[PDB]
Amino acid sequence: VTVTVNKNPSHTVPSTLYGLMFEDINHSGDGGLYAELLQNRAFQQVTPNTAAALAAWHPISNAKLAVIQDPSPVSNALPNSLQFSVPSGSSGRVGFTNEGFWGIKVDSTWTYKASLFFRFPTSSSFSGALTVGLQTNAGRVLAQNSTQIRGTTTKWTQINLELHPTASAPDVSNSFFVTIDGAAGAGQTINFAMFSLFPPTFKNRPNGLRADIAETLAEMGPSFFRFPGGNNLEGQTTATRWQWNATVGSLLDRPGRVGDWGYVNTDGLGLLEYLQFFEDTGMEPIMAVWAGYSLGGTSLAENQLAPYIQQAIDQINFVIGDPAKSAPAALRASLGHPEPFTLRFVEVGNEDFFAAGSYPYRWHDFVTALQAQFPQIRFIATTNAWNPVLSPVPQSYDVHVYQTPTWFYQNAFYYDGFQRNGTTYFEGEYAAISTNANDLFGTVADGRLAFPTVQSATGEAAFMTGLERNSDIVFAASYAPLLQHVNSTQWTPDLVSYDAGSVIKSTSFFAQKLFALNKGDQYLPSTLPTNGGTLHWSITRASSSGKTFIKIANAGSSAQSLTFQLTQFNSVSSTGTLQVLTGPETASNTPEAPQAIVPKTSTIGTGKTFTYNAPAFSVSVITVTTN
Ligand SMILES: *[C@@H]1O[C@H](CO)[C@@H](O[C@@H]2O[C@H](CO)[C@@H](O[C@@H]3O[C@H](CO[C@H]4O[C@H](CO)[C@@H](O)[C@H](O[C@H]5O[C@H](CO)[C@@H](O)[C@H](O)[C@@H]5O)[C@@H]4O)[C@@H](O)[C@H](O[C@H]4O[C@H](CO)[C@@H](O)[C@H](O)[C@@H]4O)[C@@H]3O)[C@H](O)[C@H]2NC(C)=O)[C@H](O)[C@H]1NC(C)=O
Ligand SMILES: *[C@@H]1O[C@H](CO)[C@@H](O[C@@H]2O[C@H](CO)[C@@H](O[C@@H]3O[C@H](CO)[C@@H](O)[C@H](O[C@H]4O[C@H](CO)[C@@H](O)[C@H](O)[C@@H]4O[C@H]4O[C@H](CO)[C@@H](O)[C@H](O)[C@@H]4O)[C@@H]3O)[C@H](O)[C@H]2NC(C)=O)[C@H](O)[C@H]1NC(C)=O
Ligand SMILES: *[C@@H]1O[C@H](CO)[C@@H](O[C@@H]2O[C@H](CO)[C@@H](O)[C@H](O)[C@H]2NC(C)=O)[C@H](O)[C@H]1NC(C)=O
Ligand SMILES: *[C@@H]1O[C@H](CO)[C@@H](O[C@@H]2O[C@H](CO)[C@@H](O)[C@H](O)[C@H]2NC(C)=O)[C@H](O)[C@H]1NC(C)=O
């Protein structure tokens, strides 16, 4: 096919076009991006005197463990303690282990920071060392540190010790431990709370993020981060919704919450940790606020909304407010960040097409109040576009689609027929999740993708060529979900997978990275692809350099050739770069073969006329200079 490129740009490509969608799913927060290594670190939101309260915790030797509702807790936000007792007639190391989130990576080049709180509920004459460390799950110590404690310590006391392993472990089958000498400790009871173990973090931020995951997200070149949900924003009930103010300040004041994916969230990854990550990566937020609906189906009545509207104003003031003018803005300053953060976009709710009966008054009342406080923010509606009719008129809508790979190439012209009437569209969640059109959300046996495939990535890439062509009205787009712990999964496929030790970049990750890193600010019109065909392309140009990015998705089973005609331009470079992602249709990156499918980069001859043979199931980028 001959593709003639117009030397005259039609529109500017928004700076925000490609970004990330985040919620705590598949242990993407706790156990994922948040660097904390201990699971169930503070017994948040568990029922005392149950086995489930002791999740991830195990005795060493004859230790007796129970999670209790502490008559004197370390904080009212953390009402549960671990009650540790050593039987009389004991000797040798006695204590407990934390198995982590299906392991702990022990690396000799890393310094770890361990901490815990303890007290003796009854004053005793105990005198001896409290040792913390890292061991193999077989029981051999890889790193340790200790401090002297006394049984007269009846007040809650924090212990802070560093750990230096000298060996890396051979695998991630390792545990954190806390022990005393069982002879010195025989008959003793100690209450413990609020445990923590951190590795070195991204940009050395206190309470920060896991470095290999954070660097992988930065490598994609994203322009925005949508957070904190997603379903995980909404709660099962009004009482279980995400609340900003429960995620800020001391870890002793963060109660945690049961999220929407079966596990407790510590809220250790809270609002200030998010905002610091954006500052550290150059991403801007698309921040959601809770809008009066929860996933059990309850809408708050219109006359019940006012306190929830004020809580959304407080959340925004924390991000952008003048510290002299509000308590939340003064709180951000008191936490070490008096400058406001960037915030241009706020999403009102999540998937309110499920609650469209009440969204018109929830939208009206939230946006009337929030727009008056923050005239400079763009508020994004979450119902289906224009049905129901909202007031005030939304400037933007969030559109989600999960479909087959074939649907994505067949619908690359989704936005071409939309009116240009001042509304912008956010593709806030998309993915090709299954080859089964009639059971998309089923099992792997019935066509669900365990991991993205070359087929799914090339379909998504065809759909993305249409997002770019229509970027006069499409301002932003994010694959979802972003992250997956391979040992605790509620949804597949996901963009980036990991275990306690390593990260797997999917085919879909490489497609997102190829699109986001090779994006100009000028859209160059070209010959239109066939509407419903397998072969798609989009051309953009960097106004300052004349770098010209030709993106080509062949989502079909046969090779196709393209003849590019750039004879309108004054000058085209004699050479260009080629970046290709291709492989067998059903090939995936997996924990067993994590680099099965990776892009190949080369340099090719180009000029005003050149030909490219797009392999079956491929995503290609050709970069030339034009003026
Ligand atoms: C920008 O341009 C867009 C596109 O033209 C405008 O979008 C239109 O907005 C109006 C409201 O402002 C919508 O009108 C409502 O229409 C429904 C009937 O919907 C059905 O019929 C439509 C043809 O009329 C059709 O477009 C619809 O298709 C959509 O939904 C289906 C699935 O549901 C989907 O398959 C399609 O792809 C579309 O997504 C649908 O089949 C009608 O019931 C409404 O009447 C109620 O509300 C009005 C106004 O308050 C009231 O007077 C009535 O009494 C009643 O209460 C209402 O007319 C129209 O559907 C939108 N069109 C599309 C394509 O979405 C948009 O308004 C423009 N914005 C600006 C800023 O100008
Ligand atoms: C995050 O912030 C949200 C707000 O955006 C917080 O949620 C709000 O929590 C407050 C405090 O719980 C709650 O306000 C109370 O509503 C209660 C239940 O309907 C009222 O009973 C209560 O009035 C009493 O307490 C006030 C002081 O808190 C007194 O000033 C008042 O006179 C009342 O006093 C009686 O009751 C108390 C016992 O509480 C007693 O000491 C007195 O002697 C007297 O008997 C409050 O007004 C809000 O309704 C909640 N708002 C929302 C939107 O949910 C949330 O808790 C924060 N989370 C964290 C972790 O900090
Ligand atoms: C045990 O932990 C202590 C407390 O973290 C470590 O002591 C710190 O070591 C660092 C690096 O030398 C110093 O900057 C801190 O000032 C020390 N703090 C205190 C309070 O002493 C000690 O290095 C650790 N020991 C081992 C063997 O790992
Ligand atoms: C976490 O998941 C990983 C990846 O699936 C598991 O490691 C695999 O385990 C199976 C079953 O033993 C083996 O056949 C594979 O060789 C393992 N793969 C890799 C890449 O190591 C791991 O066992 C899981 N961990 C826990 C604690 O369940």
Ligand SMILES: [Cl-]
């Ligand atoms: Cl032709």
Ligand SMILES: [Cl-]
């Ligand atoms: Cl022209």
Ligand SMILES: [Cl-]
């Ligand atoms: Cl120009």
Ligand SMILES: [Cl-]
């Ligand atoms: Cl039980």
Ligand SMILES: [Cl-]
């Ligand atoms: Cl368990």
Ligand SMILES: [Cl-]
């Ligand atoms: Cl043992």
Ligand SMILES: [Cl-]
């Ligand atoms: Cl015993």
Ligand SMILES: [Cl-]
């Ligand atoms: Cl006993």
Ligand SMILES: [Cl-]
């Ligand atoms: Cl030691």
Ligand SMILES: [Cl-]
């Ligand atoms: Cl020391």
Ligand SMILES: [Cl-]
């Ligand atoms: Cl509460």
Ligand SMILES: [Cl-]
């Ligand atoms: Cl205020």
Ligand SMILES: [Cl-]
């Ligand atoms: Cl398919």
Ligand SMILES: [Cl-]
């Ligand atoms: Cl399943």
Ligand SMILES: [Cl-]
């Ligand atoms: Cl075909």
Ligand SMILES: [Cl-]
């Ligand atoms: Cl072929």
